[PDB]
Design a binder for this molecule. Structure first.
Ligand code: NDP
Ligand code: NDP
Ligand code: NDP
Ligand code: 8G0
Ligand code: 8G0
Ligand code: 8G0
Lengths: 459, 459, 459
């Protein structure tokens, strides 16, 4: 009767719900409508005040959150976002998505998300430390290795994970896998930094192989990426390793595009990584080598990369939600883009999704642009967090090769599940690619819904 | 301003600190001096009264301790010592060492140590049971499988571990890996009894192979060992298995030396083991066969074995701290000893260490006596305890061969790390052996210090 | 066998033990020797590292302690001392005393003591806040309204209690009487600030009334006080209210003596109170009015007040332990002092006590100087803390008059108990005053010892 407006959450919900309705799911099992009503209300939300001291001795106040959305498949799992936009609506969209993403990994992880409106930009490392100490002082009451296992989303790196982990141990007096994205000597997993970007690229490899009947791969393709943080960096590295070209990165202030044919180099990605560790903008490094080379790089203030990259074969938005508009989607199609996968959560606007999906239904086979939703394509991060949990519970670390192999198998299974599910419940016209968004949504949702029923959450 | 004098702890600290100062560590990273000040104050110490009833019905009072020194790398881990010398100073030296030893294993274990001034000698098994029951009644508030995992050091065998484990389960109502050194049917690990002695010998094998360019091994070498408990027994067995000769054992009342050329036999080690299970002295068994054979054995009351064994190639003090004096170190050098490794914690006096290290810097290659500190060489015990924890968390036991293989890999990695670290930070003159004490200390310390920084313990 | 030297604790123990031996206690009940051995080993001690951030952003490290000595009569109870001298020995002397003091109040409070070597002098309020936050972050694991209830001893005021209480609530998520000395709006008791000083004076009133057969009182008497903190301030105020003269106060840097006949005024005590709130020395206020008036005040740097006050009738050391030497005791006797009561814990050296007691046995009636130990005379503070606990458990505050009346009854009962106990177990020669130190010690000890036996601590 009197619920507040939560636009981001409503967007995520509406897209999921629409894909479920536009299938035979509720014809065969109309009772699953009850599951949808129940699943869409989070099990628990904690909000709390975070008072912390700045370097001048002043009192500062921020808001802390943890949404514990669903635990049918496992303990709550998902990142912490420290960004000035953060509110309950955003964290609910993220936590809702997380439920179904986690289901697609095949691991036992429920969905959650948290964070704060604290803005790490402009803060000293000391200020970030004090903030994390205050934040976890409250959060540690509500989380635990078999309860809720956070990690780092936007604004939360290994640095923040460390300060958070330290304070948890201090209060709780237990050394356990309560956070993932931990450091190598204190319970971290090899491949976790790489996991999301690598996984997105692994997933798109299956998309390319399927759409082109094994004729094409990333070798020789031009890939536009947005963001320049954890997901963007490692997606870029994997593309390069597979012989593809990375033709854009961006941040909140502008885009850094490759001028003509060519690619970001691993060395350049490393320099950008070090800049971002220091919480600096791409704009701050384009006045010196190598990024001042105007024949290789064009910095465009205030722009997203999509309309400025020219011809592209693959688009991997890897920054933030709603970062590909309807217009930009049409431009990418016109630029020859045949593959778009979300590194970022809810990276595409609804207008963009509708554009990509309309295009898929109008164009046979490899002529279609194929859209993969984040809950499928970006699941590598949380999957590898699941493996970090597994390693922590075994008290033994695995090799890079072991973790990467499992990650590859998970991304393959996720792709196949979404493809086959779409084929069965939302069968496309002959020659048309099945909807990976529809298939992924149905596959994630039904697994969760049935587990919920088994456990008496609904009946 | 008004801190008490803790001689053993101060000794351990001073030796660590000196080795760090005599390197390039603080030239490259002077901030690590802050880490040293923080790490050297234990996170937590619990002391408690232990009232227990003797077989006559009398009230008896002893003191109980658990030092929880550092948890950056994992839950607190280290043994319990029941010996009349026990006090906070001793347990702090042991727990401080434990931090860096544990770091060298590559497993996620923090450093701790505890115990009591209770003297098991002269007690009935019933008295030991009542004492352990009382002791754990308090200790169980402070320990746990993800918090602090004790085990048996001097005076604490599988018998005491059993009584302790029983009482923990009774109160806490959890069956978990809270202690290691457990029995085979109730969560123990194969190879744990053997682990420390085997590991010391494994480590020395790498020392011999490196110093002699693969030309020598334990085959044909004469090895003087002190103590006759868990570490000494299994070190002796491994030496014998590798074709070496064990020419001494000792206890608190005297030494039992091999008279001439020859060795303790596995059968004789077993008889000594059974004597020690009964808490009897070596002096009590030399009046009968086989130990009354004066052509094989000489019992020397009140003596350590070092000056009485004649020519020796390897010395493995395996009893207690400060059991090789400056004089005894010179005698071992004069007797041709080229390898000395601590089975016992802080087995060498500082005078001994200085003598061994001066000798190493004065003599090229295989001419030097090479000293390996306990934190490197005796780490096999705690390593295998880590694997017992891993097995308990998996709910499945491993084979003897699996545990032993991992132990071998751990001792190899520990040796290599200490060797290469010494080579990099405290580079010896050409032809001179790198300092394993310096390398081990730097390698353990930096790993802990950096994890502490990551977790906000210092900044 | 290998226990560390704890001089202050040994002093407290030896004096108690001597008074018990010099009585008929162990003739009638020799089994109580067993009780003494058990009671003298603390039930539990927690020590912990306290890392805190100074105003420059530097890491600082101090040591934290809580001695939980005895809980036969109630939850552990006693103050926190923040002073650079603090170590385990000091806190054990204090906690040991606390057991028997608490027993004499008639309330259900066990004995404990804690604190830190942190020195509040030279720190900002912000630094003190950060220190208290860090300190309680660990201490809150070990204390609670029905477990252990600390409060403020030397260096710990209502300010520090507030910061400590805040952090406890933050972590533990319980609002309860875990600390006493709390503020008026957040669970404090009327009369708690006044309690110790008032109580000392109340107790001495009974001493005067008894020794002089009701002929004298505080009216017209000259009272030398040491210290200028909580105990000294309110002892001074009560003396003034009863028509006595306060002729000295002191701090760690010197004494401020009344020059001739006259008294500190309540207004002057208030100014000194405000100076001490700011953590400043008496030396800093003698350069201005009213304390620059050399006809009223003499400031003597580096001196205790005892030899500089001339003729005095009552001495109330109210600063710290061992602050009246053997010499100073003889001087006070020579100055006509007939009443000495410890505001401070273990205020008198053993030499002083022996001097006062020898004098009592050599001089009949009112000719003797009468010594009252702190465990009797300074018990008003902890008694009123007991009433603060009672008020917190009732969820209702009492009036100033209610609390003060109970305090008066408690001090009367304590005096009577010590007097009558001395009369029964250590009967003085006819005309000689009974030993209040002996009587107080026996009365406190037997109550605790018998409760311990009832509860199975010894048998
Ligand atoms: N890390 C992981 O494992 C997972 C991440 N994701 C999602 O990937 C995306 C990126 O996360 P991640 O790389 O880890 O985060 P990072 O903080 O490391 O990087 C985020 C990047 O996106 C930019 N960005 C963030 N918010 C905005 C915004 N409101 N407007 C414009 N630009 C913005 C940032 O620019 P700037 O520096 O200027 O602010 C930065 O370049 C997110 O949507 C995240 O939820 C999905 C699955 C796993
Ligand atoms: N057990 C393990 O896994 C580990 C042990 N260590 C260290 O190895 C050493 C031996 O431990 P462990 O074998 O397990 O213990 P045990 O109790 O099984 O045996 C100890 C041996 O050393 C003698 N000993 C102990 N204390 C003294 C003392 N003050 N003076 C003279 N002799 C003494 C004992 O003689 P007696 O019987 O007469 O008292 C006994 O022979 C210790 O320093 C221990 O800390 C190091 C790493 C792992
Ligand atoms: N507060 C209470 O309710 C109780 C207190 N006590 C005892 O009363 C005595 C005073 O405590 P309290 O008034 O509360 O504490 P405060 O900190 O308020 O005042 C302590 C006074 O004693 C001085 N002082 C403290 N330590 C030393 C030292 N080593 N050497 C010289 N002077 C020193 C201080 O001088 P400066 O400022 O220069 O350091 C100050 O004037 C202590 O012995 C305490 O244990 C006994 C029963 C109850
Ligand atoms: O649980 C995680 O490791 C994690 C961290 C950051 C983002 C995500 C996500 O799936 O969006 C998960
Ligand atoms: O943790 C252990 O298993 C243990 C037991 C005895 C000694 C030691 C040690 O490293 O000294 C560890
Ligand atoms: O428990 C208390 O309130 C307290 C505070 C300060 C000192 C004392 C004491 O008895 O010495 C008690």
């Amino acid at each position: 009767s009197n619920l507040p407006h939560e636009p981001e959450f409503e967007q995520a919900y509406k897209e999921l719900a629409s894909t479920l309705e536009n299938s035979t799911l509720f014809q065969k099992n109309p009772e699953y409508r009850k599951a949808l009503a129940v699943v869409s209300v989070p099990e628990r939300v904690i909000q709390f005040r975070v008072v912390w001291e700045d370097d001048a001795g002043n009192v500062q106040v921020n808001r802390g959150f943890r949404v514990q959305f669903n635990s049918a498949l496992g303990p709550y799992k998902g990142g912490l976002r420290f960004h000035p936009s953060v509110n309950l609506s955003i964290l609910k969209f993220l936590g809702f998505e997380q439920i179904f993403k986690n289901a697609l990994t095949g691991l036992n992880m429920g969905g959650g998300k948290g964070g704060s409106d604290f803005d790490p930009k402009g803060k000293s490392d000391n200020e970030i430390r004090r903030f994390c100490v205050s934040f976890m002082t409250e959060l540690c009451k509500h989380i635990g290795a078999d309860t809720d296992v956070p990690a780092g989303d936007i604004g939360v790196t290994g640095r923040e994970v460390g300060f958070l982990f330290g304070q948890y141990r201090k209060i709780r007096n237990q050394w356990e896998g309560v956070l993932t994205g931990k450091g190598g000597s204190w319970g971290g997993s090899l491949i976790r930094p790489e996991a999301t970007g690598y996984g997105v690229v692994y997933y798109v490899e299956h998309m390319i192989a399927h759409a082109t009947n094994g004729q094409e791969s990333f070798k020789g393709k031009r890939v536009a990426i947005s963001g320049s943080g954890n997901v963007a960096q490692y997606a870029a590295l994997k593309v390069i390793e597979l012989g593809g070209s990375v033709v854009s990165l961006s941040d909140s202030q502008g885009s850094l595009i490759i001028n003509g044919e060519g690619s970001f180099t691993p060395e350049e990605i490393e320099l950008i990584a070090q800049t971002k560790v220091e919480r600096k903008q791409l704009a701050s490094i384009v006045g010196a080598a190598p990024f001042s080379d105007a024949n290789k790089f064009k910095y465009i203030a205030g722009a997203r990369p999509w309309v400025h990259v020219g011809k592209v074969d693959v688009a991997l938005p890897s920054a933030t939600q709603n970062e590909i508009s309807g217009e930009e989607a049409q431009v990418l199609i016109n630029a020859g883009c045949k593959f778009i996968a979300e590194g970022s959560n809810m990276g595409c606007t609804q207008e963009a999704i509708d554009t990509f999906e309309a295009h898929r239904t109008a164009n046979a086979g490899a002529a279609a642009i194929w859209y993969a939703p984040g809950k499928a394509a970006n699941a590598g991060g949380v999957a590898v967090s699941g493996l970090e949990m597994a390693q922590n519970s075994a008290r033994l670390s695995w090799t890079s090769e072991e973790v990467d192999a499992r990650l590859k198998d998970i991304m393959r299974d996720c792709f196949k599940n979404g493809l086959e599910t779409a084929q069965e419940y939302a069968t496309p016209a002959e020659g048309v690619l099945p909807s990976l968004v529809t298939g992924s949504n149905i596959a994630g949702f039904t697994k969760v819904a049935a587990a919920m029923k088994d456990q008496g959450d609904w009946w």
